[PDB]
Amino acid sequence: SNRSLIVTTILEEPYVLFKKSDKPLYGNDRFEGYCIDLLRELSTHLGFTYEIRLVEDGKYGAQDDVNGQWNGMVRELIDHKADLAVAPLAITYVREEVIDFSKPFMTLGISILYRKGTPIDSADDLAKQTKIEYGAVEDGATMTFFKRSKISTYDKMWAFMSSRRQSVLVKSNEEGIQRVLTSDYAFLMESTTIEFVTQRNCNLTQIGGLIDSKGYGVGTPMGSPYRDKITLAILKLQEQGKLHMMKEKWWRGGC
Amino acid sequence: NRSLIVTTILEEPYVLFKKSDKPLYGNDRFEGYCIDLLRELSTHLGFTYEIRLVEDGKYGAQDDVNGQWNGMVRELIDHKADLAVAPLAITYVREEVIDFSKPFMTLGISILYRKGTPIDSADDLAKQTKIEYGAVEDGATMTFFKRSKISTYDKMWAFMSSRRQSVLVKSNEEGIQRVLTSDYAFLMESTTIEFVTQRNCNLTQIGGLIDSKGYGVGTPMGSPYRDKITLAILKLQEQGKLHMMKEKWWRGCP
Ligand SMILES: N[C@@H](CCC(=O)O)C(=O)O
Numbered sequence A: 001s002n003r004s005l006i007v008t009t010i011l012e013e014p015y016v017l018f019k020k021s022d023k024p025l026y027g028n029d030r031f032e033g034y035c036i037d038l039l040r041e042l043s044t045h046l047g048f049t050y051e052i053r054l055v056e057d058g059k060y061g062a063q064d065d066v067n068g069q070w071n072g073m074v075r076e077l078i079d080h081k082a083d084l085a086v087a088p089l090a091i092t093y094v095r096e097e098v099i100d101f102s103k104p105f106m107t108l109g110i111s112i113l114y115r116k117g118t119p120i121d122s123a124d125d126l127a128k129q130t131k132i133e134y135g136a137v138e139d140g141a142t143m144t145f146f147k148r149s150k151i152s153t154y155d156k157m158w159a160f161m162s163s164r165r166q167s168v169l170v171k172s173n174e175e176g177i178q179r180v181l182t183s184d185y186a187f188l189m190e191s192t193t194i195e196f197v198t199q200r201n202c203n204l205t206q207i208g209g210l211i212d213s214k215g216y217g218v219g220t221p222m223g224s225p226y227r228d229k230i231t232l233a234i235l236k237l238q239e240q241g242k243l244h245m246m247k248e249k250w251w252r253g254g255c
Numbered sequence B: 001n002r003s004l005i006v007t008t009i010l011e012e013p014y015v016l017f018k019k020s021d022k023p024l025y026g027n028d029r030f031e032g033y034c035i036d037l038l039r040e041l042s043t044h045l046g047f048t049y050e051i052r053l054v055e056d057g058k059y060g061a062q063d064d065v066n067g068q069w070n071g072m073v074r075e076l077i078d079h080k081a082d083l084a085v086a087p088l089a090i091t092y093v094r095e096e097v098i099d100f101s102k103p104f105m106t107l108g109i110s111i112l113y114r115k116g117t118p119i120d121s122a123d124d125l126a127k128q129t130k131i132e133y134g135a136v137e138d139g140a141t142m143t144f145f146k147r148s149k150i151s152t153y154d155k156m157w158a159f160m161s162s163r164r165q166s167v168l169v170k171s172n173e174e175g176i177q178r179v180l181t182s183d184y185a186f187l188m189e190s191t192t193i194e195f196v197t198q199r200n201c202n203l204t205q206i207g208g209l210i211d212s213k214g215y216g217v218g219t220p221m222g223s224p225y226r227d228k229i230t231l232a233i234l235k236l237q238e239q240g241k242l243h244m245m246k247e248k249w250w251r252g253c254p
């Protein structure tokens, strides 16, 4: 029998979660969510077995500007510590330079999560002021977008986030949501995750539209033969609408 | 170094002939979103190119009897073009035989029709025959319907196939004209619908997106340009240059 593939992932509702149960669960049986359903479809169509492992450092992945090293799921793939990353992992220029991605299984963009009842309507409006703090997940794609942007509004926002980083950069989306709920703080968040959150907490809203456009893809080490195979499997699922059905299943609930 | 041969197809606002009273020659004949994209790719990757319209006028589909591809897809399979730079949908059946860059635009199939009617979805079309409907022959929309297992879309394919000589058309332009001049709904890509409805205030999109797909640059399978073009697209997207190009070419109605 062929070696089981090691699949790195990260906890992020409704993509990847621990199942609720009173008895202890083991192995792959611990996990559920959209990305777990996707993994299951990939494994049956491509004919592999797998072991799910949560990324050890708890990060998506960014490059350190001083020493040039990556972290997170991206680094696990670079180092061949995982065969695949099946997660809400954004396909980005800087990541595509060092790892391979399948074509996207979902498309999205950065937007803003905030409390209802405000005249703030856009990133421009946030950038012009400092009473309302704002931030993003540390060492993820949203942070990196702001750090690399040459657009004046976003450059200004990065200077603020960077100055205040110990307070405004958070370690998970969950922590960002709690900051929105417990302080005067707006969270720069991926739009598909905002959709999930605002359907379940009717005090919160999206502010403005999408700031960029990107996709989530399955990550592989650079050169992996699984990359193109997984692209084909994803495209075949899209011929029959099975990914939008999986999205409906995990985003169903609202406000 | 050798200029890459770029296959393309006329499709507003992606690729058009420039208007002028004097004759134009070579690459200078063309403009549009995809032409602006090609220029950016060529500067960033450092190649020169020659644009050639696909001779058969097709995007590309597989013949159900003899297994041959046509259109831009066939030009790439046969190594007659180095790149296809066009509103060319990335699809499973195409990806099996050619390579694509990652998407420069995302979209889905939807419906173009007149305003003011009770038709609100594909299901409403599928259950009747008074209002005819169709798609571009030998494109990705047609192929989606031909391959679909979903009952509504399978019923719609049976109708299109029965009525093909009348309801399958050779271009989006032809499909628009059928909507405007007969009781006909056109199954059309949503970014093209957005362009059309901004300029035909009696037309509208019906329902939402029927599927999810992207447009990518096509290459022959195994080409080294595929990954380089993906990186250049991704770099344009980290600065919002593609949405600005979209805005330039899409530019309304009361
Ligand atoms: N999905 C992101 C993390 C969340 C965010 O950056 O907003 C990533 O792939 O890095």
Ligand SMILES: N[C@@H](CCC(=O)O)C(=O)O
Residues within 6 Å of the ligand: B059, B060, B087, B088, B089, B135, B136, B138, B139, B140, B141, B142, B187, B188, B189
């Ligand atoms: N863009 C399509 C043609 C138009 C359509 O099929 O709606 C293709 O790549 O085949």
Ligand SMILES: [Cl-]
Residues within 6 Å of the ligand: A115, A116, A117, A118, A205
């Ligand atoms: Cl509000």
Ligand SMILES: [Cl-]
Residues within 6 Å of the ligand: A237, A238, A239, A240, A241, A242, A243, A244, A245, B212
């Ligand atoms: Cl889908």
Ligand SMILES: [Cl-]
Residues within 6 Å of the ligand: none
């Ligand atoms: Cl098949």
Ligand SMILES: [Cl-]
Residues within 6 Å of the ligand: A101, A102, A103, A231, B100, B101, B102, B230
């Ligand atoms: Cl790819």
Ligand SMILES: [Cl-]
Residues within 6 Å of the ligand: A213, B236, B237, B238, B239, B240, B241, B242, B243, B244
């Ligand atoms: Cl963009």
Ligand code: NA
Residues within 6 Å of the ligand: A095, A096, A097, A098, A099, A100, A101, A222
């Ligand atoms: Na790569």
Ligand code: NA
Residues within 6 Å of the ligand: B094, B095, B096, B097, B098, B099, B100, B221
């Ligand atoms: Na391919």
